[PDB]
Design a protein around this nucleic acid. Sequence first.
RNA 1: GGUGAAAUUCUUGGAUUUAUUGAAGACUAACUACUGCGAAAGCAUUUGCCAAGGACGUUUUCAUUAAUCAAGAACGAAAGUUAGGGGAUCGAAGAUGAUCAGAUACCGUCGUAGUCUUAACCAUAAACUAUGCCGACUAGGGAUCGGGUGGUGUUUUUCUUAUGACCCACUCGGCACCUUACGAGAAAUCAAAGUCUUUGGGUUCUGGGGGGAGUAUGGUCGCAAGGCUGAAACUUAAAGGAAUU
Lengths: 223, 150, 81, 25, 98, 127
Amino acid sequence: AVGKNKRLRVVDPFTRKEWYDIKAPSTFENRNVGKTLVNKSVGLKNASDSLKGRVVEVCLADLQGSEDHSFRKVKLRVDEVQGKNLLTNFHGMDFTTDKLRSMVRKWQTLIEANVTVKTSDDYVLRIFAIAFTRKQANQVKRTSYAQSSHIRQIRKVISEILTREVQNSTLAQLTSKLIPEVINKEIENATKDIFPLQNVHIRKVKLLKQPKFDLGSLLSLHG
Amino acid sequence: GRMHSKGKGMSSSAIPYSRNAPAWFKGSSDGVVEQIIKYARKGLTPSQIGVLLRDAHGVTQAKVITGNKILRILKSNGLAPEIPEDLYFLIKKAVSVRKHLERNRKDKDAKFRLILIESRIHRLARYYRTVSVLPPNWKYESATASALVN
Amino acid sequence: VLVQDLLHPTAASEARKHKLKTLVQSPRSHFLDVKCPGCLNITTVFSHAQTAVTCESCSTVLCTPTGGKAKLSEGTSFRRK
Amino acid sequence: MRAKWRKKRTRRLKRKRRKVRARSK
Amino acid sequence: PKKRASNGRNKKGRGHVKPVRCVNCSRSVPKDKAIKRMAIRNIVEAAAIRDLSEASVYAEYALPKTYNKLHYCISCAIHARIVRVRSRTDRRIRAPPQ
Amino acid sequence: SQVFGVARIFASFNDTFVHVTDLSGRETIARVTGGMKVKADRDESSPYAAMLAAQDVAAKCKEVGITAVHIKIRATGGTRSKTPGPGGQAALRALARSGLRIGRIEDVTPVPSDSTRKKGGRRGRRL
RNA sequence: GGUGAAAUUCUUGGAUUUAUUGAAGACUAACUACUGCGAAAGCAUUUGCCAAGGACGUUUUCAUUAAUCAAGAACGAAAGUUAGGGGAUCGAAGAUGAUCAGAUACCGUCGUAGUCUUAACCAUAAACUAUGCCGACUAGGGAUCGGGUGGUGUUUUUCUUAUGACCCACUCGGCACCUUACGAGAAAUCAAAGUCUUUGGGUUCUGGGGGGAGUAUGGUCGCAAGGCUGAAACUUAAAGGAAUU
Ligand SMILES: [Mg+2]
Ligand SMILES: [Mg+2]
Ligand SMILES: [Mg+2]
Ligand SMILES: [Mg+2]
Ligand SMILES: [Mg+2]
Ligand SMILES: [Mg+2]
Ligand SMILES: [Mg+2]
Ligand SMILES: [Mg+2]
Ligand SMILES: [Mg+2]
Ligand SMILES: [Mg+2]
Ligand SMILES: [Mg+2]
Ligand SMILES: [Mg+2]
Ligand SMILES: [Mg+2]
Ligand SMILES: [Mg+2]
Ligand SMILES: [Mg+2]
Ligand SMILES: [Mg+2]
Ligand SMILES: [Mg+2]
Ligand SMILES: [Mg+2]
Ligand SMILES: [Zn+2]
Ligand SMILES: [Zn+2]
């Protein structure tokens, strides 16, 4: 603190600022999230200008109530500023590091699957999958690896499933499908033939490309 | 214990004791011979023919039933090919490798493999010359090899 | 150990031992009389096929090839030769 | 002295020797 | 002489194992001669848990664990007492103590 | 009932950060680092400094109106360290014991899916 | 920032830090093992194409076609050499800040060449299992990977299912490992390093005290660095190996 740099009045900037309201899409339960803080609107350079585009990454348990959804995470992009309220849209789903890493146990093969897909709208989504190989309750063998061919087959199946599930309906619809882990269950059901399998999750949904803006559609996700 | 790899395997067919025709098998040796001839005409190599006999029909081994090996039979009828079967196959394999190499150049493993194949072919050629199945001057190259294959 | 009759061993032991490594080499494979559910014809199919063997009269596919022993086509019924 | 270092020294010497030879030529 | 029949490595059937860097000093070490200690530490220290609990919104909360595999070059390991020098007769024990 | 922010603790092996932001994580409410509070240069990382920083942060938070924080704990990451510094735990403790509310705690250390080359060379830091 | 402590360096024209993004080139974490494959060097993101391959199964076919190899070939880590492209990181040289009696060393900060790639070259490494290859035989024991057999064995369930995954038992081939040696060995140790004074299954290569020396010279191959080949004079009673207190 004694060391000084060469370096070759409006104190307390929070008095120059106002609070807003994070409004999540109608897909979730706890529809209002929390508070966001922005500078007061100066003539040319409004408050609503430097807001639309902001990402609020929040826990999925703090939207649904139940803490069986604690490991999941959701990015929400601010779109329409109501005046005090700001309406968000789904931007990206995530897994927290403390579960993803937890589930990567040694002595079993992890199967990871990618896919890029358009929705029934024009949303380009890259969605990821993790599946692990299970010690089938009977086993004496201290491992339970899958053979490479089997793994490949599983991956293919997963990809197919993902393609089927996206391309068919809106991003909102996809989100709805995702929350009670239906897709995962479906995947599990599919892959019971190829290999036992366990801890099947869609980890990570990444948005890449969105259509125009379409205000009406966005609104139809609120009220 | 293998000829070009470190491999040490012992997987092989084990021919039964009795030279005599199996007790359950009826038919006739002549019939078998006829079948073989037909197969040859159709355009099959001895091994393939043998396999067919084993599978679709009651033939265990041709020498067990007819008294003669398939190749011999083929020769007798005037159907045994210009190049012996195994050698031909080897040549074909070599040609494929060569073709592959022509397309992509940096494949060093492939190149290495090709050399091995060539060596094998040469060995076989030498054997054949000694036995005088091939004309005693027959050589294997590249274009010529391709021609032979096709 | 130490003292054995190497000439005539127990049958079970022989069975356990690999083909070739037995006292005298003999195949473990066998031939089969295959009855197709439709027509009354008997075809002699070798237990370790390789080829997709059909009945000589009608194309039905009696056996599909696998690693070792070939697999029969469900509707078919066999009898060991 | 490490063998590697000795080798290096030898190499160095040889370069000089080579140069000398070239000059002579 | 050979101090170890394993050569201190664990490879044999391989030929070349890709090197991992040391987590302590970055001494590039083969992934088998690597000494891999997988540390599952709790994200909050044992004495500071109660306070955190008291603080926390939503009672009956998970409190996660942090996960990492650590790779020590053998010298570093020796220094930091992850591994110790053993007797000729009891070097042989491959089973972990616990 | 609650106003939420993001605590963002970044504790390297030397010098420690606290950094409260809003839920969006774009607008900031006090940084305050370990080097600010203790001017002894080596003590930038030491728990005491971290604690002090946390205390300072808390006051600021109180002034603003942020009753509650989610904590994001971070080590240097990438090629470097990965193990959290000495003054992260202390900072957390300080945060806890200021009357301020807590919930949702995660590690956000930038772990690579195998990365660029690490600093030090083959034989590394030979001390 | 960095550190054992510092300093070098960047910073109110706002460093660090936070959030979204974008580009560029790297690399392929965790999974990852006394596991896989390849002649070795080596080889982990997905998918497609392109040929190749070991093991196994085989009442298929040829019928001694084989084993090992002076001559000759093919590949051959990393550095290094030309000329392009790329140049994020890391970094021989360099700068440069400390530490020291010195410190153009370790530590710190930068940083050309190099690191990546495309055409050439280079031919070496503790290129190590410091164990040449092929074959036979001798001793138990569990594992494990690849395949194949037999189990009214378990589960799956869409009713029998049929696969798949397990479970048990056997079997070839592999990476290993554990205990004993009745054999070896100077011993450390070794299921080969055993079946050797009770000495002969087939073969290629290499060594003959330590230095001088992988030097001198002559070839030869390299654009060059270098490689392969390789002495003698003279010198010396030891150099060494494994174990011991
Ligand atoms: Mg053999
Ligand atoms: Mg040979
Ligand atoms: Mg020693
Ligand atoms: Mg191998
Ligand atoms: Mg090596
Ligand atoms: Mg030290
Ligand atoms: Mg800034
Ligand atoms: Mg594997
Ligand atoms: Mg990976
Ligand atoms: Mg030679
Ligand atoms: Mg290089
Ligand atoms: Mg220097
Ligand atoms: Mg200096
Ligand atoms: Mg340095
Ligand atoms: Mg050498
Ligand atoms: Mg050697
Ligand atoms: Mg001498
Ligand atoms: Mg000694
Ligand atoms: Zn029929
Ligand atoms: Zn280290």
